[PDB]
A paper describes a structure:
The current work describes a 5.5 Å resolution structure of the putative trans-activation state of the engineered mini-IFNλR1-JAK1 complex. The present cryo-EM structure of IFNλR1-mJAK1 depicts two JAK1 molecules symmetrically dimerized via the N lobe of the PK domain, with the TK domains interacting through their C lobes and their active sites facing one another. As in the nanobody-stabilized complex, in the nanobody-free complex, we observe a similar arrangement of both the membrane-proximal FERM-SH2-INFλR1 and the dimerized PK domain below, additionally stabilized by the V685F mutation. These two domains form a compact unit with clear density and an absence of significant interdomain flexibility. In the TK-PK pose observed in the nanobody-free mini-IFNλR1-mJAK1 complex, the β-sheet from the N lobe of the TK domain abuts the ATP-binding pocket of the PK domain, interacting with residues in both the N and C lobes of the PK domain. In the short 3–10 helix that precedes β1 in the TK domain, Arg872 (mJAK1) is within predicted salt-bridging distance to Asp675 in αD (C lobe) of the PK domain. At the TK-TK domain interface, a primarily α-helical interaction is formed. This interaction is largely composed of the helical packing contributions from αG and αEF. As in the PK-TK interface, the TK-TK interface provides little buried surface area (783 Å2, ~5% of TK surface area, per AlphaFold-guided modeling into the observed density), in line with the proposed transient nature of this interaction, which is likely necessary for JAK-mediated receptor and STAT phosphorylation. However, rudimentary modeling suggests that, in this TK-TK configuration, the tyrosine residues in the activation loop of one TK domain are capable of reaching the active site of the opposing TK domain to be phosphorylated.
Author numbering:
A (entry chain B): 441 to 480, 492 to 604, 613 to 734
B (entry chain A): 588 to 604, 613 to 855, 867 to 1153
C (entry chain B): 1028 to 1153
The structure:
């Protein structure tokens, strides 16, 4: 790390568990040729001199050519400190957009601060008379999906409905915070949820329908016709979608080909497919 | 703490919110999970409110399938019984300030365009007493609860006069204007010591009252009558506003120097499961209307939600057949608790901590001598003889159904299977499809559904074989019959049972059974009911055994 | 199994008791001759076109009087030991009835084989 204040790094040690063996490296706020490490209850600091690209610990007559060469060397020894002794086990690394003293607070960047929803779920209900249940489409992971059509939202719009399996109503929690977490997302590469439906005991996520279908069998069918820029753009757009997802501190544990659904074909012409 | 409108409430305590704070939890009834919607938008609507006269909800709890509203606890309790208890000590400024603060709370409610369809004394909970000193009591408004829009048509008529006739005509006509009607109803209620309004009036009479467009109730004061008529308007759009009510009451309070055998589900404190059958379930409950845990433990029988109407009628029959019974060796009946809509009924018996002989005997090996279970047999014979003299056949005479009241007395229960015989027949024929103790029945009771008073002699003999052997699982008539009939299988069992019985097979001599006891005892299972003994003869023989 | 002449049931499951041979009701013993009884019941169903009015359920019920769930198999066994069987189906030929009633002999050893049934039926074709 750079010249980050002591309180920041001390707090960082608390979050992981403050177990003996961890350590954090950051540049000394006063000296350009010295790195300081904080080890950890006790919190011991240690300084290392870096001269002419050569690395060595203060009080030690030996020297090492690389910082990694230096720090790897001390991995296999015991450290004596007054009466207490310990062995380092693991380092600490930076985190995305980690708030610290080096950052500058501005009015325009304030609007981009993430919202606080640690214990909040919001969702919109869909009246049971506003939907039409259609034919089945296949059973998912403890989930059944039928054909759907929404009315009075234009009107008579085909939608996708998903029914949680009655054998697993105990997991209606994950059901709820999965239906809720998609309310906050807003990107062209993500599905659109009109809301949730309530009747009797079962429930439905009314999601966007796309005729393109999943890319799995699509790619399975015309492999010989595929091109290289095709997969380049396919990868880059889903990578951008994942960057958007991580930009809102949200997790998607099902990043797979089965969760990649095509929108447009574009194979025949210069236009690119959409997923 | 007591059952609400399809809701159960237990004691609660929240941790790591200070810590170790007592809270109030409310559990929606599993029989009505279909109404989890109104549940949800009732739990949500209280998130937006913020006033000192309203409850505080810490949130909602999730686990398995059930859910809980964690609400604020107050030791003051509801104002209903509070006002009931010290009516003679009440004062006029007391009710003035009580009315004005709840009116201010209702104005706050209408200021946020929210509806509360349960403005009643039962939803008024006290916070501080203040009677002794100049400080005034504090009350706070509770949750709206289940909406009336889902109540039955019958359930829409018991809320009279608290319910507005507009919602009665159509539930869709609900609006904030109906809150003033409940407000005026409560105003009248607090003016007469909380007396039940429109009591001694049938449902049809209340409907006639609404349709006749007559005044529901009148006070004895001119100004009170004026203000009530001003707030008791059949036109919802003509009802004046709350701030007008506050100004009127503030004017008048200075203008007037002169001051002038049923059980409630809310008082049923369930403790622990007492007994579950194929169609019904018995719970252990404490009836504590005072809320001080000084109530009386009672045994309550209930039916599972998926029970049919035929089983409902069977249960009702159970009530009336037991109601006219009165004997020292039978379960005691006290009253009946009604559920909302008339679709549910609770049967209340006596809870005996001694339990039944099935459980009492195994834990009491050495303290019963032969004389004691001989007395028990005398008691059971007397109970059946009383029942037979009333032309009833219990049809479920089992030691598990023989409740114990003391080490000198037992009682008989589980009368859900008891049937009366008509005045011009010698037996009864069963029609209902229900599991039955086939091992406790006489051969005719297995072959032709024919049940006599001599049939209960067979059941008594089985129960005595149970009793003298101290109700041993090792010697259970279930297992004894099973082993004497070989490996049998469910539907198969009764067949081979009949086969062996026609072969002259019976239960063996119980351990250490005296020869005279065995002789009189085997007399009970003669094949022909006409050749079977009577319970008067059994009592005579047993008492001779005492001599 | 390779060294037995029948089978004994242990699992607790609802079973078509009206379709079973007397040993299948009394001792859980199920033979290949046991399926001859079931075939005869099914043929009584088939020739009568599977009539609800002539259902073996209802036919047996009415020949055994008013019975009741757990009670039914008892009286069923009683009547069967009395020599009672399902009646002649409507318009059933005399030879068809003769070969057909052969299926419900009380002793499984005295019950016919399905090869014999096929032979008799094909002779009926001729
Ligand atoms: N008054 C009572 N006191 C104590 N236990 C009771 C009482 N009434 C019923 N029970 C318990 O309920 C269980 C079942 O009761 P019973 O009415 O015999 O059968 P069912 O299961 O049909 O209700 C028994 O084990 C008995 O211990
Ligand atoms: N979220 C979805 N959007 C569009 N189509 C879907 C979705 N989930 C499943 N399908 C359709 O279901 C079928 C396979 O599950 C395919 O026709 C696929 O297009
Ligand atoms: N919301 C509530 N806050 C405080 N006490 C309550 C509440 N609901 C019920 N109770 C208590 O339950 C009992 C009667 O239901 C009384 O002791 C009453 O105080």
């Amino acid at each position: 790390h750079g010249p980050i204040c002591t309180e920041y790094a001390i707090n960082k040690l608390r979050q992981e568990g403050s177990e003996e063996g961890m350590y954090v490296l950051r540049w000394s706020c006063t000296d350009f040729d010295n790195i300081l490490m904080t080890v950890t209850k006790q919190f011991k600091n240690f300084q290392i001199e870096v001269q002419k690209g050569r690395y060595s610990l203060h009080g030690s007559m030996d020297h090492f050519p690389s910082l990694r060469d230096l720090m790897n060397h001390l991995k296999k020894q015991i450290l004596r400190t007054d009466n207490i002794s310990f062995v380092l086990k693991r380092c600490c690394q930076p985190k995305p957009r980690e708030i610290s003293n080096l950052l500058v607070a501005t009015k325009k960047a304030q609007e981009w601060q993430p919202v606080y929803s640690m214990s909040q779920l919001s969702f919109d209900r869909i009246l049971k008379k506003d939907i039409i249940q259609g034919e089945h489409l296949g059973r998912g992971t403890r989930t059944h999906i039928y054909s759907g059509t929404l009315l009075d939202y234009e009107k008579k719009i085909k939608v996708i409905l998903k029914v949680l399996d009655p054998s697993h109503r105990d997991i209606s929690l994950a059901f709820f915070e999965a239906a809720s977490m998609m309310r906050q997302v807003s990107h062209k590469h993500i599905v659109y949820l009109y809301g949730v439906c309530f009747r009797d005991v079962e429930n439905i996520m009314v999601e966007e329908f796309v005729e393109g279908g999943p890319l799995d069998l699509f790619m399975h069918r015309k492999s010989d016709a595929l091109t290289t820029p095709w997969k380049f753009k396919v990868a880059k757009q889903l990578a951008s979608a994942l960057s958007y997802l991580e930009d809102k501190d949200l997790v998607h544990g099902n990043v797979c080909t089965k969760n990649l659904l095509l929108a447009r074909e574009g194979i025949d012409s210069d236009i690119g497919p959409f997923i | 703490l007591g059952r609400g409108t399809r809701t159960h409430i237990y004691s609660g305590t929240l941790l790591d919110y200070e810590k170790k704070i007592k809270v109030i939890l409310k559990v929606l009834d599993p029989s009505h999970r279909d109404i989890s919607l109104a549940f949800f938008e009732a739990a949500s609507m209280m998130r937006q409110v913020s006033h000192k006269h309203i409850v505080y909800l810490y949130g909602v709890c999730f686990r398995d399938v059930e859910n809980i509203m964690v609400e604020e606890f107050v030791e003051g309790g509801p104002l209903d019984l509070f006002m009931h208890r010290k009516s003679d000590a009440l004062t006029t400024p007391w009710k003035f300030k009580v009315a004005k603060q709840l009116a201010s709370a209702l104005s706050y409610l209408e200021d946020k365009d929210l509806v509360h369809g349960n403005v009643c004394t039962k939803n008024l909970l006290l916070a501080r007493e203040g009677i002794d000193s100049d400080i005034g009591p504090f009350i706070k408004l509770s949750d709206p609860g289940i909406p009336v829009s889902v109540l039955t048509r019958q359930e829409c008529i018991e809320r009279i006069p608290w319910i507005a006739p507009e919602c009665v005509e159509d539930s869709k006509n609900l609006s904030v204007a109906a809150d003033k009607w409940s407000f005026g109803t409560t105003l009248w209620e607090i003016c007469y010591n909380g007396e039940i309004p429109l009591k001694d009036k049938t449902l049809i009479e209340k409907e006639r009252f609404y349709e006749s467009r007559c005044r529901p109730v009148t006070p004895s004061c001119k100004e009170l009558a004026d203000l009530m008529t001003r707030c008791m308007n059949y036109d919802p759009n003509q009802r004046p506003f709350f701030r007008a009510i506050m100004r009127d009451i503030n004017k008048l309070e200075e203008q007037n120097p002169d001051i002038v055998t049923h059980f409630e589900k809310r008082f049923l404190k369930r403790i622990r499961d007492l007994g579950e059958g194929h169609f019904g379930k018995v719970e252990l409950c404490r009836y504590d209307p005072e809320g001080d845990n000084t109530g009386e433990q009672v045994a309550v029988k209930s039916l599972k939600p998926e029970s049919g109407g035929n089983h409902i009628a069977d249960l009702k029959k159970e009530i009336e057949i037991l109601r006219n019974l009165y004997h020292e060796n039978i379960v005691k009946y006290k009253g009946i608790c009604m559920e909302d809509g008339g679709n549910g009924i609770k049967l209340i018996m006596e809870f005996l901590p001694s339990g039944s002989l099935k459980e009492y005997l195994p834990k009491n090996k050495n303290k019963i001598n032969l004389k004691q279970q001989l007395k028990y047999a005398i008691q059971i014979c007397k109970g059946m003889d009383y029942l037979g003299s009333r032309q009833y056949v219990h049809r479920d005479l089992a030691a598990r159904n023989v409740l114990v009241e003391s080490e000198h007395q037992v009682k008989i229960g589980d009368f859900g299977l008891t049937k009366a015989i008509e005045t011009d027949k010698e037996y009864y024929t069963v029609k209902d499809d229900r599991d039955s103790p086939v091992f406790w029945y006489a051969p005719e009771c297995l072959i032709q559904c024919k049940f006599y008073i001599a049939s209960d002699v067979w059941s008594f003999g089985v129960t005595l074989h149970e009793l003298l052997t101290y109700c041993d699982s090792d010697f259970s008539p279930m297992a004894l019959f099973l082993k004497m009939i070989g490996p049998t299988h469910g539907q198969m069992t009764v067949t081979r049972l009949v086969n062996t019985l026609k072969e002259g097979k019976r239960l063996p001599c119980p351990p250490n059974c005296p020869d005279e006891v065995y002789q009189l005892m085997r007399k009970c299972w003669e094949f022909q009911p006409s050749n079977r003994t009577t319970f008067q003869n059994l009592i005579e023989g047993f008492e001779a055994l005492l001599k």
